[PDB]
Each structure stands twice: as structure tokens, then as C-alpha cells.
């Protein structure tokens, strides 16, 4: 109610709209950095999968506990366009399913918003990590992954999965659950014993799948942040347009009132 | 060349005389002929042909054109260019050089806002060298205007967008 | 109107219709009349109607008019633009962006409109 | 609206409703640009109760029956205080937001939520 | 190794029984500090519906 | 306020203070909607210096002891120049924001940080 107060609100919202427009292109740039990091880690995982296939097929004399019958990935920061909420919504469906079966559930948490969610509903988290950079390093995941591997060796867990978002396209992030632990004419010159090699390779394989899930979730996060800052830029434009119409009304009314007072004062003098 | 350091103070003096003479007031209490006050003054600043000078001087001066260039100054209130006297003079003049308080406080001393400032005469009033080198300067300042926000986050920019920005910051 | 009466179709170009409105405001203030909303003359709609109603198509010929329009304070709801838009049949918008691409004429096919 | 005129129970219920609606009005611009998901765990719960209070204040009238078709409702002061006190205490946090719209007394919001 | 291909699957850090166990103990320690006690779990569905409705209005 | 009337050292300090405060005026509205963490490493540092400069402009006057309670401070031109150049160059980035509020010359700000 006052042209000048309205003019100050318009300038304030305009200053905010300029940075949310810039933050969209910054999110797209970081999305491309995450997509190149997703591709760079694939050769190692596919090759480890190709070895374990023979060292088990070719060697039917030994079965690892992981070859006979949740880790949750989340962001550490704001501006996520429903990314974490769509993932928790999808997770609760499977946790509810495990209670219809009457089974107990163990949980591992990656990221601050995931820790905040389970802490607000009393979730029984067994292992956690948070405050990771936008470009994470595999050596930080070893801890959280081992606690979950040990619970399998101790017979406390029948199946283990990684809960994270998958990059369908630059405009679509899909929440998913992937099973981790339960997975031709010549033979290798095994220098150490074959058990030691298979036991070590299965661990490297599971850690690599968790690292790939974490890096793909970060690509999904930058894509979700792009949409959120695009929406914030568009929402601010509607508020600016409405305030400009209110400002023009106050501009016209002030001129009409001043003229009425000048004509009224000059009729008396 | 003539400089009128404050046409807004001339309008205030003419408004005083008009109200004391009891003439009917309009918007902001100015008289009905305040537009004619500044227009009658500013239309004298002109360039006259050789025939005009030859006729005026009775043939004493031949083959030469005379001129009077004007640089009127007006003071706005909190950047409001829609006020009555500023609106009249902006419509009478051939162009406007807008100075801004935000640019002046940000260390940009000759506070000329190139984005809104205009000269309707344009390159016709420029030497060959300046006209040739001025076109590139305008493109840079426009680019920098469309890329200023990305200055506090230059790390994440394409080389070419990063390039446009660095040329803009130096030209400014 | 003389050319129209010869049986012709005529073009009337008005350099600026806002200056016609302002000249009416100035004359109304000089004559001492009581000002209206936003300080315009009380006769604003009648002065516009007296000019615009002569520009029509008749049984003898027609006068078509192209009028340049100035919008005060960028406010399309201001009495001058609002009174003028009631008489216009088409709106041609010239774009600085289209002229930069080398296209001429610089009409904006999305912002320009017609009642026809 | 004074403790010495209407008693402390009515006065505190009315003051509680005004505090929740005032805090919801302060968040309107933030919610319009960034949405509800960015608010704190405390503000999210308050906004959910503010939306229910705002809807429970509605009431179908016996003179408005011609406009919509719905039958009119008369609600006593006792039923009015009990409904808003329960929503402020959190006794209805599980019922859906549309169950409070156009229902007279608080018990009818419980029956409307069954659909 | 294969007669027509040589693959080296390297590790970014030096694995070892102390380093391998330390990271697990720090991850366990983090989860102890994070969780204090149980809470209402039936609220998940209502909270998810509240946020699913609120998240739609924003776009 | 001209280098030909006073000197370049004084003028550069004055324009330096003005530059920092002018840039902070646009960031104040940014921090209030999107938070401090979204600013650049240079912007976060500049905002902290601007808030400190804004406080070092304060000074308790002898005629204001009845309003402030604390004693009055007279500061000299050279002392004023040296204090503002120190905050601009980063010599006090480690001191807390509240240490510059109501403290005459720059020395007392270093002492207030210890209380």
C-alpha cells in the first residue's frame, strides 16, 4: 500500500530472479561433470563382473556366502526438485512389504537429508556418512559398505540393496532399488589361492556398484536443481508482474489525489 | 556549445511566477505552458544551412554552416524519469545520457548507463576512426550485461561464454 | 477528407497520437477547466472520438490511418493509452531483436495483432 | 474477547488460532517462490495445522442452501472450542485437509474423512 | 591377463585390516550418534502425501 | 572529497569502503531468500567485511552517554583511515563481528574481541 514500498519489493524480487537464472546454467554445467564421471567408472565394474563369472563357473568347488540365498543415497543440500521425497516414497513401499512378510530391516545412510528423514521417524540406522563433496571419492564409502557386508557374513541380513536415483534423461530422474550382495574353454594361472581372489573381488564389485550409485545420484541431483531454479525464476516473474500492476495503480492514484488537492486549494485562495 | 546546468530550476522559477500571477495549475502545480517553455528554448539549438548564413550575413560569409549544440541538465528524484518536467524534456531532446547512483557507488565514476542512453543522430556525428572502433565496444558491453551474474561462478562456464565475460569486464 | 471525396482510398499518418492528447491537456489547463484522473483534461474521450470517428470507410471512399503510439511510464492502463486502444483495429510492434538478425521489416509476428 | 468475560479456555483457543494463522501468513512469499518442502520440520507442521484451521472456520448456512444445495448447520460455542482446541493440540494430524471444509461440528470432519 | 589383453584393476587407496575396520567403526559410531530412540512410523504415509501435494503446486 | 584537496590514500580508503558497502546492498536480499552458503568464496568473505565495516562506523559520543551508558570516544583522521584500511586489506578477518560495535579506534576492537 504505497508506490515506493512496492518499487522496493520489485527490485528485491528482480535481484533474486537474476541469480536463480544463473544457477540453472551452473547446475547444467555440474550435471555434465557428473555424467562424464559416471562413464569413466564403468570399465572397472564390467571387467570385475567378467572375472567373477569364470572364477566361480570355472571353479564350482567353492561358493562364497554372497552367491547363495538397504544403503540409501541422498543429497547434503537444498534446491532439490522432489529428488529425495520421491526416493523415500518408493523405499517405504518395500519396507512396508518386508513387515507384511514379518522380516527385520537394517539401514545405511549416505547424505544429510537422508539422516534427517530416518531421525524424524525413528529409523534403526546401523551405519552412516554425510557432508560429501559434489565430486565424491570411493575411499569414503568403504566404511558404510563394510558394516553392511559384515551384517551379511554374520547372517543378520538375507538380502542387501542400494536405494538411489537413476538418470533416464536430463529431464527425468527415476527412484530405484538395486540388489547388491546376491548376484569358456581355458583356465587362469592363479598365483594365490582362488578363495582369496574371489573373496576380494566380490568386495571390490559391491563397493564399485555403491560408488556408481552415488555418482549417478549426484548427476540426478544437478538435473533436479536445474528444474528447481528454472521454476524459481518463472515463479518470481509472476510476482514481479502482479506487483507492477499494483504499482501502476498507486502511480495513477497519487497524481489524481495531488491534482485534487491543488485544485481544491486554488478554489479557496 | 551551451550548457543549461538546471532546466528543472528554471521550471520551478516559472511555476512560482505563474502561481503568484494566479494562472490555472496542472500536474505538479506547473502551468499549462511548461512544455512550451523548454521546447521554445531547446528548438533554437540547431545546425543551419549555408543559404541561411549567406542570407543572414548579407553575403559577408559564404559556403559555411553555423550551429548551436545544447547539453541541458535535469535532476531526477530517486531515478523517477516519469515525473512531469523530466518527461517533457526527454521527449524534446535528440538523445539522453543517463547517470546512475548504483553505478557511481560501485566505482564506475563517469556513471553513464550505456544500455538506456541513446543518440538518435548516431554515427553521422562520429569521425571515421571512432565509428569503426565503436561497434565492437557496444557488443562487449551488451554481452557483459547479459552475463554479469555468472561472474561469481565463472569456474562453471564454457570457454567461449567465459571468454565473452572477460572481454566485457575489461571493456567496462 | 478531400482526397476521400474524390473516390480514393487514403493513408493518414499521425507522427504521435500521445502528443495530440498532451496538447489537449495543455489547452484545457490554459482555459482553466477542472482536471480529471491522472491530471488529463475532462474532455479526453470526446477529443479522441472527434478525431478518430472521421477516419472510416464510406460509400465514396476511405481513410486508413497509421498512428505512432507512446505509452507513459510503460503503464498500458494509463488514461492516454487506454482511451487510444478503444479506437485501434490493429497493432504493429517493431522489434530491436528482429532487426539485429538482418530481417527487415522488424515486425514481431507474435506480439503484433489485428481485430481482422 | 477477554479472559474475565469468556473464561481462559475460550480465550487461549482463540489466541492459539490467531498465532497459527499469523505465522502461516508470514511464510506465504517463501512458499510461493520455493514451495512448502524447504520449510523447517516445525514450520511444516504449523502450516499443515493452519490449513486445517482455515478450512474448519467454513460453515454451510441455512440461508445459503439455495446457492449450493447443502443443508445448513448450527454449531454451539462448546463444540466450536472443542474442535479448534483438538486441531491445535494435534488430535487430528492424521485426517485429510479437505475433511474440515463445509462440515459444521468437529465430529462431522471425522465422518467426512471416511470417504 | 589373456594372450590378447592385459587388464589392471587398480585401487584408489591402500586397503588393510586396520584401515578396512576403522572406516566400519567410524560409520557405526556415526549411526549411534545420529539415532537417539524410536518414533512414530505410521506417519510416513501421511507425511509423503502432504509433501506429494505440496511439491505439485510449485511447478 | 578530492585527491587534489586531501590526498590519494584518504580518497582510496573512502571509495574502497563505499565499493564494499554498495556490493553488499544487492547481496543482503539474496542471503535472506536462498541463504549464505549459495554465495561465492569471494562474496562470503566480502559480506563478512561489509558487516564489520558497517559496525566499525559506530562510535559512542560524549553527549550520548545518557543514552548509551558507555563513555565517549574522540577518534582522529589518521586513526580512522588506518582502521578502515585494516578491515579492507583483511588484517582483522579473524575477529568476531560484534567486536567492532561501539569502540572508537581500531585498537579497542582487538580488545573487545577478548571479552
Secondary structure: helix percent of chain E:
55-70%
Order of helices and strands of chain B: EHHEHEEHEHEHH
Q: Give the class of chain B from helix and strand content and strand pairing.
A: mainly alpha
Binned strand content of chain E: under 5%
End-to-end distance of chain B: 28 Å
> What is the CA–CA distance across the termini of chain E?
54 Å
Structural class of chain E: mainly alpha
Radius of gyration of chain E over alpha carbons? 23 Å
Organism (chains D, F): Pseudomonas paraeruginosa (strain DSM 24068 / PA7) (Pseudomonas aeruginosa (strain PA7))
Subcellular location (chains D, F): Cell inner membrane
Main location (chains D, F): membrane
Function (chains D, F): Produces ATP from ADP in the presence of a proton gradient across the membrane. The catalytic sites are hosted primarily by the beta subunits.
Explain what this protein looks like in three dimensions:
- With 269 residues, chain A is of the alpha/beta class.
- Helix content of chain A is 63%, strand content 11%.
- Chain A is built from six helices and five strands, in the order H-H-E-H-E-H-E-H-E-E-H.
- In chain A, strand 2, helix 4 (112-121) and strand 3 (125-129) form a beta-alpha-beta unit.
- The longest helix of chain A has 75 residues, at 194-268.
- In chain B, 45% of the residues lie in helices and 8% in strands.
- Chain B is built from seven helices and six strands.
- Chain B is mainly alpha-helical and 172 residues long.
- The longest helix of chain C has 14 residues, at 17-30.
- Chain C is built from five helices and four strands.
- Chain C has helices at residues 2-5, 17-30, 44-52, 79-85, 96-100; strands at 9-14, 62-67, 90-91, 113-114.
- In chain C, 34% of the residues lie in helices and 14% in strands.
- Chain C has 116 residues and is an alpha+beta fold.
- Chain E has 59 residues and is mostly helical.
- The N and C termini of chain E lie far apart (54 Å).
- At the A-E interface, helix 2, helix 3, helix 4, strand 3 and helix 5 of A face helix 1 and helix 2 of E.
- Chain C: This is ATP synthase subunit beta.
- Chain C: It is found in: Cell inner membrane.
- Chain C: Its main location: membrane.
- Chain C: Produces ATP from ADP in the presence of a proton gradient across the membrane. The catalytic sites are hosted primarily by the beta subunits.
- Chain C: GO terms for molecular function: ATP binding; ATP hydrolysis activity; proton-transporting ATP synthase activity, rotational mechanism.
Amino acid at each position: 500500500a504505497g508506490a515506493k514500498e512496492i518499487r522496493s519489493k520489485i527490485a528485491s524480487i528482480k535481484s533474486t530472479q537474476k541469480i536463480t537464472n544463473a544457477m540453472e546454467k551452473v547446475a547444467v554445467s555440474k550435471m555434465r561433470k557428473a555424467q562424464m564421471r559416471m562413464a569413466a567408472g564403468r570399465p572397472y565394474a564390467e571387467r570385475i563382473r567378467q572375472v567373477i563369472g569364470h572364477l566361480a563357473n570355472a571353479n564350482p568347488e567353492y561358493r562364497h556366502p554372497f552367491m547363495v540365498e538397504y544403503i540409501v543415497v541422498s543429497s547434503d543440500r537444498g534446491l532439490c526438485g522432489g529428488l529425495n521425497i520421491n526416493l523415500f516414497k518408493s523405499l517405504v513401499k518395500d519396507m512396508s512389504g518386508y513387515r507384511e512378510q514379518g522380516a527385520e530391516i537394517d539401514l545405511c545412510v549416505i547424505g544429510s537429508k537422508g539422516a534427517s528423514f530416518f531421525r524424524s521417524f525413528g529409523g534403526n540406522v546401523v551405519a552412516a556418512i554425510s557432508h560429501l563433496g559434489e565430486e565424491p571419492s570411493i575411499n569414503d564409502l568403504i566404511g558404510s559398505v563394510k558394516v553392511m557386508l559384515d551384517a551379511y557374513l554374520e547372517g543378520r541380513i538375507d538380502r542387501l540393496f542400494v536405494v538411489s536415483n537413476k538418470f533416464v534423461n536430463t529431464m527425468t530422474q527415476k527412484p530405484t532399488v538395486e540388489q547388491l550382495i546376491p548376484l569358456h574353454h581355458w583356465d587362469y594361472l592363479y598365483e594365490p589361492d582362488a578363495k582369496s581372489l574371489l573373496d576380494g573381488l566380490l568386495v571390490r564389485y559391491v563397493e564399485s556398484q555403491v560408488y556408481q550409485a552415488v555418482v549417478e545420484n549426484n548427476a540426478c541431483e544437478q538435473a533436479a536443481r536445474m528444474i528447481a531454479m528454472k521454476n524459481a525464476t518463472d515463479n518470481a516473474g509472476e510476482l514481479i508482474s502482479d506487483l507492477q500492476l499494483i504499482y501502476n495503480k498507486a502511480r495513477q492514484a497519487a497524481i489524481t489525489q495531488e491534482i485534487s488537492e491543488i485544485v481544491g486549494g486554488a478554489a479557496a485562495v | 556549445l551551451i550548457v543549461y546546468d538546471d532546466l528543472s530550476k528554471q521550471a520551478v522559477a516559472y511555476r512560482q511566477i505563474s502561481l503568484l500571477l494566479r494562472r490555472p495549475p496542472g500536474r505538479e502545480a506547473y502551468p499549462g505552458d511548461v512544455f512550451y517553455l523548454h521546447s521554445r528554448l531547446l528548438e533554437r539549438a540547431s545546425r543551419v544551412s549555408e543559404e541561411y548564413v549567406e542570407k543572414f550575413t548579407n553575403g559577408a560569409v559564404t559556403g559555411k554552416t553555423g550551429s548551436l549544440t545544447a547539453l541541458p541538465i535535469i535532476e531526477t528524484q530517486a531515478g523517477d524519469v516519469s515525473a512531469f518536467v523530466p518527461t517533457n524534456v526527454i521527449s524534446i531532446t535528440d538523445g539522453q545520457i543517463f547517470l546512475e547512483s548504483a553505478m557511481f557507488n560501485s566505482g564506475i565514476r563517469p556513471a553513464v548507463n550505456a544500455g538506456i542512453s541513446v543518440s538518435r543522430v548516431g554515427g553521422a556525428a562520429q569521425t571515421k576512426i571512432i565509428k569503426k572502433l565503436s561497434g565492437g565496444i557496444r557488443t562487449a558491453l551488451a554481452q557483459y550485461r547479459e552475463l554479469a551474474a555468472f561472474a561469481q561462478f565463472a569456474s562453471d562456464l564454457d570457454e567461449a561464454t567465459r571468454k565473452q565475460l572477460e572481454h566485457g569486464q575489461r571493456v567496462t | 477528407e478531400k482526397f476521400r471525396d474524390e473516390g480514393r482510398d487514403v493513408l493518414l499518418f499521425i507522427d504521435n497520437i500521445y502528443r495530440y492528447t498532451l496538447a489537449g491537456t495543455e489547452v484545457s489547463a490554459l482555459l482553466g477547466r477542472m482536471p480529471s484522473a491522472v491530471g488529463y483534461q475532462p474532455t479526453l474521450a470526446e477529443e479522441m472520438g472527434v478525431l478518430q470517428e472521421r477516419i472510416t470507410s464510406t460509400k465514396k471512399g476511405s481513410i486508413t490511418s497509421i498512428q505512432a503510439v507512446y505509452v507513459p511510464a510503460d503503464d498500458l492502463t494509463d488514461p492516454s493509452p487506454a482511451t487510444t486502444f478503444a479506437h485501434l483495429d490493429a497493432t504493429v510492434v517493431l522489434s530491436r531483436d528482429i532487426a539485429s538478425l538482418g530481417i527487415y521489416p522488424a515486425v514481431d509476428p507474435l506480439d503484433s495483432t489485428s481485430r481482422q | 474477547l477477554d479472559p474475565l468475560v469468556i473464561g481462559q479456555d475460550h480465550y487461549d483457543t482463540a489466541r492459539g488460532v490467531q498465532y497459527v494463522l499469523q505465522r502461516y501468513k508470514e511464510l506465504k512469499d517463501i512458499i510461493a517462490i520455493l514451495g512448502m518442502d524447504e520449510l523447517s520440520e516445525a514450520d511444516k507442521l504449523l502450516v499443515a495445522r493452519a490449513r486445517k484451521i482455515q478450512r474448519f472456520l467454513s460453515q454451510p448456512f441455512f440461508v445459503a442452501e439455495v446457492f449450493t444445495g447443502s443443508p445448513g448447520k448450527y454449531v454451539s460455542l462448546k463444540d466450536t472450542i472443542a474442535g479448534f482446541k483438538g486441531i491445535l493440540n494435534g488430535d487430528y494430524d492424521h485426517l485429510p485437509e479437505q475433511a474440515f471444509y463445509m462440515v459444521g461440528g468437529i465430529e462431522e470432519a471425522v465422518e467426512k474423512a471416511k470417504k | 591377463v589373456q594372450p590378447n589383453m592385459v587388464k589392471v584393476l587398480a585401487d584408489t587407496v591402500v586397503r588393510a585390516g586396520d584401515l578396512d575396520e576403522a572406516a566400519a567403526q567410524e560409520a557405526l559410531k556415526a549411526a549411534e550418534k545420529a539415532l537417539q530412540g524410536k518414533g512414530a512410523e505410521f506417519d510416513y504415509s501421511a507425511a509423503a502425501a502432504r509433501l506429494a501435494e505440496a511439491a505439485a503446486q510449485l511447478r
